[PDB]
Amino acid sequence: MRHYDCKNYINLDCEKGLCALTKGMVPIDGEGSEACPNFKPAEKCGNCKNFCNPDKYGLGTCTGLEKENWAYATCGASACPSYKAE
């Protein structure tokens, strides 16, 4: 629901990024951070089928491989070879 969650988001730094479409700088947090109608979800462990059981901090379990491991929900997943959109 934030630019930060969008596939069109271009990362810059800890506080802001760019919208690929508008090429305008957008905030991660707070006022002006909500997704626009053109939103497309960026691939993240948080929206992967192999990601489960997060805790309060977003730390969860990756079942992508035979042996389970931990993962984090906000971890970028566009380059994980096992990512599978939920």
């Binding site: 271009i10 990362n11 810059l12 730094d13 800890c14 760019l18 690929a20 090429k23 970028g76 566009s78 380059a79 994980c80 070879p81």
Partner: peptide, 24 residues
């Protein structure tokens, strides 16, 4: 390296960064 989120900015010709962030 190969599981990081790759970042490309508008206007860039040469690309790549250490991380998904620009000064990262």
């Amino acid at each position: 390296l190969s599981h990081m989120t790759p970042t490309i900015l508008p206007y860039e010709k040469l690309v790549m960064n250490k991380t998904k962030n620009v000064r990262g």
